[PDB]
From a paper:
In contrast, the chain of ASNase from Rhodospirillum rubrum, reported here and referred to as RrA, consists of only 172 amino acid residues. RrA is homologous to the N‐terminal domain of typical bacterial class 1 ASNases and exhibits millimolar affinity for L‐Asn. Crystal structures of the wild‐type RrA, both with and without bound L‐Asp, as well as structures of several RrA mutants, reveal topologically unique tetramers.
Based on the previously published results for typical class 1 ASNases (Derst et al., 1994; Schalk et al., 2016), we tested two mutants, RrA(Y21A) and RrA(Y21F). Finally, the Y21F variant grown in the absence of L‐Asp crystallized in space group C2 with two complete tetramers in the a. u. RrA(Y21F), also grown without added L‐Asp, nonetheless contained L‐Asp in the active sites of some protomers, presumably co‐purified from the cell lysate. Other protomers contained water molecules, ethylene glycol, and/or chloride ions, all contributed by the buffer. In all protomers without a bound L‐Asp we observed a putative H‐bond between Thr16 and OD1 of Asn26, which belongs to the same chain as Phe21. Although both were less active than RrA(wt), RrA(Y21F) is somewhat more active than RrA(Y21A), which is opposite to the results obtained for typical class 1 ASNases. In this role, substituting Tyr with Phe preserves this role better than the mutation Tyr → Ala.
Numbering used by the authors:
A (entry chain D): 6 to 170
B (entry chain C), D (entry chain A): 6 to 169
C (entry chain B): 4 to 168
Amino acid sequence: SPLRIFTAGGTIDKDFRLEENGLVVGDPFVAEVLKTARLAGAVSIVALSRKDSLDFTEADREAIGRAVGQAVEDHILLTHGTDTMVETARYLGGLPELAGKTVVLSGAMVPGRVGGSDAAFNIGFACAAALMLAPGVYIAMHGKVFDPAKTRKNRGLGRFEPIDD
Amino acid sequence: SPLRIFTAGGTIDKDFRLEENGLVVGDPFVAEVLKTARLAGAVSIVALSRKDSLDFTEADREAIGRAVGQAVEDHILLTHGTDTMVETARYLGGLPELAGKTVVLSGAMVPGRVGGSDAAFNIGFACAAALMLAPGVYIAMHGKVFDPAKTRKNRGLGRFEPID
Amino acid sequence: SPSPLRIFTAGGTIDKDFRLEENGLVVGDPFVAEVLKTARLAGAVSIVALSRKDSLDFTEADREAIGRAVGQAVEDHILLTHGTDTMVETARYLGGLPELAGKTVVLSGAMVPGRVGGSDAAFNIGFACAAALMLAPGVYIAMHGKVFDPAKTRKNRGLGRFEPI
Amino acid sequence: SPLRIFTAGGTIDKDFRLEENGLVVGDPFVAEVLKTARLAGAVSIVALSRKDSLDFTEADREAIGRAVGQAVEDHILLTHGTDTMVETARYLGGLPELAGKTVVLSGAMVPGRVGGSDAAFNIGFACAAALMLAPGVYIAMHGKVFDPAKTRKNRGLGRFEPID
Ligand SMILES: [Cl-]
Ligand SMILES: [Cl-]
Ligand SMILES: [Cl-]
Ligand SMILES: [Cl-]
Ligand SMILES: [Cl-]
Ligand SMILES: [Cl-]
């Protein structure tokens, strides 16, 4: 397919580890969504890192820039935590190796393995956005496309919204 | 630009009824998917019919053409059963009142209310396709866009594929 | 330390599964195996499939075959998963068999298939397993978080519930 | 015959709060399991406290003893976190107001709102156990009944086991 999928952990991939009575960043949830989507080929993703927003580092962010630049595909999906998605998307937007590529960041406010998740919808929408949008770096959430330069995460209302005018 | 959703029943919307001890075509599952999607914009969901592929008629297919034609929006998602999705899509492609509209048909091989369903992914994918594709009539399934004129449903593989 | 419990499956609503090629439900693999897989059980328990019928296709020959299998079991604690529409008739028939004299036999199932959202199946299986281990010798129906005497019970098909006669 | 159900929080009740990106102890999951169990009457529970195993106190434990002793019912289910369950069960075992009551503690190693949870099976089994066992205090987990004086939680293996 023309699409390459990268994962950088975050809320979307959280799973319960019963040995510590708490969530960890687990197996990439996009693999679980694509498993039941009846795709033509084997499910194929790249798992870059498995951090949550607290232990994600600038080194982890540069590693994403290098992985995406080395991909041969020009249509790119990156699943990520929402708390520092804008920071990653603005960083990728300044990399010249990404000039001709459509790069879409998405994830979920609720882990896929928790009831009532936005994850599967967001993954479908984001896959289609990555295929169909003109070259650029975008955030796809809430069934819409956000310009990362003009967007912030509101942690309190769990949503992306326009920056302060 | 705003999306309008029309529903025509099919597998995607099947639900268990205790008294039938069996499935019936239920409330549109797209509304359940959009509920947990934390949407930025308002989306109208209009139910045109609640049939399965066995009791969906040519009269039902004409009624969908009339409702899509009367829609003010140029971005339309229609949820439908897969067994005759190609026939509906080919019919809508022939209608002059759909010039300038992007109309995407989608649905699910497995009911949304059954474990292991393609429905939520296919709804996300088809919503974006309806917003982003140029005017025309399309089928969005298997994370791909199909041209209805060059596509068929393989019943046994439970897949859409190119003719040839 | 093996469970005193043997589980027999005879099909019914509990086990219904969606088949793509038919665009509808068929009686599938026993849902009790899926529930016990996530139950973290202490004791080994045998699940034996006797039949894969719904209540519409069930015969007097099938019921006689179920009575022979239960009677031949070594265990004195038996769970039988079954459709609800013919449960009372199976339970009354098992109640008449001398080979079942020393045994606790509990029939249960679900009004909604395990594999459909909003199912009573996992609750019913937990309740019925405990009932089969703890009740005095006899034949019982376990549904609605209660124990029913088959001779004094019927299925109200309209209300989708077992009730006193 | 009548069962009284009390909840004290723990793993079974954890729910994701998207405003903090983490789990909190939430609405008692037993209400969700009983909702789909098609019971004869309204689902009725007593929500005593909403601690996890790390914030639960000997005062919270004594408050459960007072609540269970005030119940008119002689069949009692208490949902609880597993890491503190043996100490609660042993404490209730010592209370004279509980002498003629069957008191069953249960819960789940995985929250009910996370996929692949033991919660619904465990509630079904423990409801039956509370109705059927002789007076005493018991832990119902792993499809069997444990004597709390002879039992410990193995945190690493997520299981109750004999001391042994
Ligand atoms: Cl995160
Ligand atoms: Cl259909
Ligand atoms: Cl049946
Ligand atoms: Cl069916
Ligand atoms: Cl806990
Ligand atoms: Cl957490």
